[PDB]
Amino acid sequence: GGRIPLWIVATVAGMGVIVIVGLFFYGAYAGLGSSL
Amino acid sequence: ATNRDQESSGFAWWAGNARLINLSGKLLGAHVAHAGLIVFWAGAMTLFELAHFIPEKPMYEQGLILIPHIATLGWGVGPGGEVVDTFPFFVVGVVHLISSAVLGFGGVYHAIRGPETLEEYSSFFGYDWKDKNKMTTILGFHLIVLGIGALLLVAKAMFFGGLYDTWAPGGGDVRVITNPTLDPRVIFGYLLKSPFGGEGWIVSVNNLEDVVGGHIWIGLICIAGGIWHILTTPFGWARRAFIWSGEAYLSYSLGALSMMGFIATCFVWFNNTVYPSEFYGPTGPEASQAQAMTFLIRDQKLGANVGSAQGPTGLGKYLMRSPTGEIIFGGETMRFWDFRGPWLEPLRGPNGLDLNKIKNDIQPWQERRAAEYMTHAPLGSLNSVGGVATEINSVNFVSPRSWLATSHFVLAFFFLVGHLWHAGRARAAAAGFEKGIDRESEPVLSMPSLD
Amino acid sequence: MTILFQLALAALVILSFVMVIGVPVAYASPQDWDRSKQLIFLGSGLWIALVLVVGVLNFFVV
Amino acid sequence: SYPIFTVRWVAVHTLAVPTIFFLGAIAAMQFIQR
Amino acid sequence: RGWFDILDDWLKRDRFVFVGWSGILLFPCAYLALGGWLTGTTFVTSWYTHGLASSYLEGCNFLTVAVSTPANSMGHSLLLLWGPEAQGDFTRWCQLGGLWTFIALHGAFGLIGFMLRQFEIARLVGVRPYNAIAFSAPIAVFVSVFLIYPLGQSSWFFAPSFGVAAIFRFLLFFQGFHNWTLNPFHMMGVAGVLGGALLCAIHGATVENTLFQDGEGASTFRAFNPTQAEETYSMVTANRFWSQIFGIAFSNKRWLHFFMLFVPVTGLWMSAIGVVGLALNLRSYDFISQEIRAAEDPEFETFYTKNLLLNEGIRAWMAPQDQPHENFVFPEEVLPRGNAL
Amino acid sequence: ANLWERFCNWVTSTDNRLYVGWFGVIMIPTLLAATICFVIAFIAAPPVDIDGIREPVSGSLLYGNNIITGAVVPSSNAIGLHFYPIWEAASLDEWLYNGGPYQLIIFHFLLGASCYMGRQWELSYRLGMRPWICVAYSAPLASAFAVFLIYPIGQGSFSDGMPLGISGTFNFMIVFQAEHNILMHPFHQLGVAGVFGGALFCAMHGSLVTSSLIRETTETESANYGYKFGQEEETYNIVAAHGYFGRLIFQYASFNNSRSLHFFLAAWPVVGVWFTALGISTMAFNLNGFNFNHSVIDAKGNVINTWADIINRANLGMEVMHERNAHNFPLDLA
Amino acid sequence: KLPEAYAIFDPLVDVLPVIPVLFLALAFVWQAAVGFR
Amino acid sequence: GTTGERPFSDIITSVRYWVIHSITIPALFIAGWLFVSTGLAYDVFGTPRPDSYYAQEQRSIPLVTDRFEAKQQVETFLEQLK
Amino acid sequence: EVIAQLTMIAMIGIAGPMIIFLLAVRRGNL
């Protein structure tokens, strides 16, 4: 219990949400719903 | 624990930069490194714009803010604002970006390795916030460096190639300025103009002669204040009027910056001289005037007599009088009759727009510009659909003028808030009650009741 | 020298990229103030040198 | 010495696992062309 | 110990998430309102009920997704999955709008469960239940807007759809058809919500800027012990400040915090009343005296007549697409329009 | 001492029933002028040609308005942003016709209110208080600057500033949505979270403190008499309110530091209203709400409408009717 | 476009302007490291 | 105090945690992906694909107009698409 | 192409967390 430093999981998790969110903003311009 | 934690420094992590108030060398690293990010951004962004630049498209159709600043200084551009050589942009971009690395190096050095405080290493670079002599001396050096920079602009305009001049004949051109304006009646007349419609304070400066001249004055003014403060110390009246603390000086500059950001916001919105519409797109007034012109032109070609056309309200459909009687475009654009631009001024007579010049002298280049500008009005949506809010998707456009004015309103506003925060706090901290009220001597408890 | 220009320019990037991670680790490790003084000083001149070299090459391919 | 399965445990999984599954669903949608 | 009492013990155990008896109503209904919203905004259309896309699947974004109301032809059907419309067919349920009633009705019972939860926890901990009382205001809003209003109208079609832009649509419908801004019951609700925000901000700022110095650090948050006996800020200096800034001030801490409950709770209640009125088209739409004058005097104009002209524009330009089941056909020439635009 | 010092000491006296202060020296005259003009114009002012088309709008009670329809009408579009003091008119009659009272009221009022904010700082200094109440007030003040100054600047006319009336406010909001799709702007959505959340947290804090009042009274007297002004001690049990609220949600979704809790109550509405004031201020420069009109289309290319398209049909109804005689050309560019 | 020489550097040039925001995020990774002391 | 359970800071720094959740999380994600990529979501929920909003030549909308005939109304519109 | 960009930002962005990582191992002076 506590073998992985909390700051590491945080950064990892964070970069993970940034990716998914970034992907959704990409989708606003590509394909369905891009007006194109 | 060299400061650096909430126990020794008294400031929590979320206000940890307040830990640097009395650590001049670490504070010097923070600033230099921060300057690094600024210069970095000027470099990285300009190259981004270059890689994305297509010289056939108007600059303002391509999301560009920095390249238009370079073009206005006379690099890379020719008549009509046509881009004729992109290499100067590349140079600005690379030189700032290289430079950021040395700022970068210098800031991270001073912030980590260097001496946390300077005042024991050299009595010249170290400082106490409360040394009124040392504080004015730093002010004076920086004053001189600003005066120099103002004069760099004069050098460019007069000795190193000139400036883009939207009012230059033949639709604009780069141009050397040889008769800067020095009459102080003009230069300082601008400062006494009302900021209200038709006057516009210093935002109304509409020729490069006034611009270059004002920068001569300001350069020489700063250099002279620099010397002043380097040699003097604050007088009795000024000592008693200000708070002398690092936070107080911070609040004073947040003040200044906020006021400047608001002025910037109106400059880019109304001024089409140092923000040429060739590069930035039309002003809001300009586009609105341009539409009236377009439909005057069209209807006149069909055979309409545009001077006698009574619109539905009883006011002229194309032409009416301003409240001081000038002939001006009709319809809603009646609010924008103060607009002045190179495409429109040739139709102007002494009493305003001139119907004979309207009937006879409109060239195709004016019909083109007016049509271009009306269809690049600075209206668009946050996701860059161009046009009014009811427009369908298709046009991917938001005016550089909207981007720059909105960003700097927001920035100027929050910087006034910062001013109030840090000025109030500085006052509180100088009097010793920023941390709260003393239960043992609560001031109100010693005051008579209001009733 | 269309290929000797990229050799220098990747040198800048690969070196920049090194010294970006390397200078701040160096600075805040207590161990080797002296095992690394030389290091950063050499990359430094190497970096500057490279900027110049890439700066003059440009003018034969730009 | 703690339990591992608890009411709390059930609470977080009733949310988290549909949430992840929905996120992959939505991810895939970004690549649908018309 | 009876089995009821053993079940009671376990349901009222001190755990990370208190359950309770009310939990048996709250957790299932809340989970399913939520889950049905997420499910429908992610995957379900509004094509057969509205002529609209409404899910991520179809390419909507978080602003334009909705679980949309059922078609007008369904009346006020409960739209039970096993009912006569969908006949147990889940896919057809979704297509006809079942998720809307599903969310609406589970949400209703979940709000019930939450309030009982507020009652249940207050009783066990031993405090007065003023929080539960406060929660009556959200409940009145929800019932009035989502249930009562459509029950007075022709069907569930005209209730709010569960989506960001769908609600914006509802705001503008209410302007163009009900002239809701003119309604004194909304006006009062506005006063209560903006007044509550005002109270929120001014009480927070007043406390934060009258603190006593109770530690020696610059971060003042660490100088407070929840078990201390003393007020952490000065009522006396707060009082003087506002007496001389604004003329009057609070002097009674209990009155001040009761006033904070009252103002917003009372505002939402008044808004609920007006929507009940609008369930019946009992609008405050017009001022008869202005209309008599205006009809007679073509030079009489006020902001009230200007606004009606806008209402008239909203109704005609938006109804054909907004109420597709009516097959409104408006030739260009009947559309009201000012000059040029 | 000498006369100027007696005066300075009076101005800054913490013993005046109402604090004057140096900011008060500007605030008092400017608010008085704004208030007297507004009250007289609201009752008696004759119709004002707001849009510059010789189509005067009656805003005052004596010319056929009631409390809800009446207004002080914005100055003429013919004026745009020109300064129109009384002395610039050829007669009061001309000044009333073109909407001069509006300029006078809002300039004196923005000045007065800007100084009201400074006054809040000033008194907190004389009292030994911390200084940032005035920061909280900057949110409402910023909002007033937006509808009365910034939006007219961007659009080029005070005729598009907010009218000083109940119905006039509605007019301004409907036209705004039409021209900027403010509902679809995140700064306005942040404003709604601000004020909704402020109302919520307002009811919560009040409910939660009221829930945990210490029995200090009988059933026949008001609970309020259990608190005495200036009492050393607290009259509610914050630990019990945490015990209730921590269980209502979970233990760490609840505040147990009175200072952290009150800072949160301050920051939530202030920040949100900062954003919605900045929203009006940036839509002033036509950076408008998200535009998703015809954003979904099918394999062939038919437009598949969304709720955003339905909003757009309402917006279009506002667009084509507003100021119905004021446009001669097809685009309404400001 | 950049000078064709620097074309291979186009996608790096694409990402560079976002770099100053990483600095703000790096400060939070740092305080997480030192546990917001 | 503590209501008894295992502190979160403790679980998510635990290795056993990430052993378990290095698998379950990505797996759930892929399950959702497949739900859309297989085209399954369309048929479960009755959501039109980009090619099934209209018949090739129609411009009117398959709006349901009857309360009890409604299931039949939708099914007959789905015939005319082919 | 876009992987060119994503490999650059991938590399640039992890550059930061790493400096923290190294200085932690080295019982550096964070």
Ligand code: CLA
């Ligand atoms: C960054 C620029 C800067 C800054 C921060 C300062 C800061 C300071 N100056 Mg220096 N100064 C500067 C530039 C600057 N100066 C330059 C360029 C010059 C040469 C022009 C001078 C010349 C100068 C002199 C001659 C003196 C100072 C003094 C001072 C101190 C008092 C300032 C004061 O009272 O403010 C202003 C505060 C006031 C209360 C003045 C009130 C007057 C009104 C309200 C302000 C507007 C006056 C302005 C001149 C006209 C307005 C134009 C309008 C149309 C917009 C302070 C340390 C004083 C000092 O102690 O010197 C040692 C002093 O006597 N400065």
Ligand code: CLA
């Ligand atoms: C412009 C942004 C900026 C800048 C320049 C600074 C700068 C500084 N901060 Mg502040 N800070 C900021 C944002 C910023 N901060 C924000 C947003 C927060 C909130 C999360 C804080 C919170 C904060 C706290 C809590 C504290 C500081 C402290 C400090 C100082 C000591 C740094 C230290 O000990 O780090 C040590 C850390 C390391 C050695 C880790 C590595 C850091 C290096 C610099 C990475 C550089 C990367 C870069 C790519 C290098 C390569 C380029 C090169 C080739 C040129 C320093 C002057 C400290 C202080 O006051 O000291 C007494 C302190 O205690 N700051």
Ligand code: CLA
């Ligand atoms: C605001 C800028 C600034 C200031 C005031 C200082 C001040 C100081 N630094 Mg730092 N430093 C800076 C920036 C700054 N530094 C930058 C950018 C770097 C990276 C290049 C460094 C790297 C650095 C190191 C590595 C060391 C110092 C040291 C010192 C101390 C002695 C330096 C000295 O006298 O040099 C002598 C000065 C000269 C020989 C005069 C020439 C200076 C330059 C070449 C003039 C050019 C000015 C230029 C035209 C201005 C325009 C800039 C831009 C707009 C283009 C002193 C406390 C030393 C220290 O603290 O002791 C341990 C030390 O070891 N500095």
Ligand SMILES: CC1=C(/C=C/C(C)=C/C=C/C(C)=C/C=C/C=C(C)/C=C/C=C(C)/C=C/C2=C(C)CCCC2(C)C)C(C)(C)CCC1
């Ligand atoms: C202190 C500190 C901090 C901060 C930091 C900073 C702010 C820094 C800065 C930094 C910097 C400021 C740096 C810089 C860098 C730079 C670089 C590294 C550059 C390089 C360049 C190059 C290499 C180039 C190249 C090229 C060319 C030449 C051409 C085109 C292409 C290209 C672009 C590629 C933090 C907050 C984190 C934390 C605490 C402490």
Ligand SMILES: CC1=C(/C=C/C(C)=C/C=C/C(C)=C/C=C/C=C(C)/C=C/C=C(C)/C=C/C2=C(C)CCCC2(C)C)C(C)(C)CCC1
């Ligand atoms: C460049 C140019 C130009 C020119 C410019 C100029 C020449 C400038 C000037 C400037 C100036 C010359 C400015 C001024 C400033 C001022 C100020 C801004 C002031 C302030 C003040 C204050 C801040 C005060 C306060 C106070 C008091 C009152 C009392 C006690 C306390 C105290 C101290 C706080 C022109 C336009 C032509 C053109 C374009 C370009």
Ligand SMILES: CC1=C(/C=C/C(C)=C/C=C/C(C)=C/C=C/C=C(C)/C=C/C=C(C)/C=C/C2=C(C)CCCC2(C)C)C(C)(C)CCC1
């Ligand atoms: C120019 C150039 C260069 C340079 C670059 C640089 C200068 C870089 C930097 C970089 C950086 C500067 C980085 C940074 C990074 C960052 C990060 C990635 C962060 C993130 C974060 C996160 C994700 C967060 C999370 C969290 C925490 C930790 C705590 C609390 C919570 C939260 C969630 C907030 C090179 C060499 C390439 C060469 C070419 C050109």
Ligand SMILES: CC1=C(/C=C/C(C)=C/C=C/C(C)=C/C=C/C=C(C)/C=C/C=C(C)/C=C/C2=C(C)CCCC2(C)C)C(C)(C)CCC1
């Ligand atoms: C309906 C129904 C049902 C149920 C269902 C359910 C129960 C569901 C669930 C569901 C769920 C439960 C889901 C969830 C999902 C979630 C999501 C979808 C999330 C996402 C999110 C996000 C995306 C966010 C992010 C972010 C942002 C955006 C910003 C800030 C930051 C953050 C990171 C937070 C049943 C069976 C009875 C059958 C019938 C019908």
Ligand code: OEY
């Ligand atoms: O929105 Mn429509 O746009 Ca701003 O101007 Mn052109 O019309 Mn008129 O005067 Mn008031 O209002």
Ligand SMILES: [Cl-]
């Ligand atoms: Cl109108």
Ligand SMILES: [Cl-]
């Ligand atoms: Cl017009």
Ligand SMILES: [Fe+2]
């Ligand atoms: Fe309180």
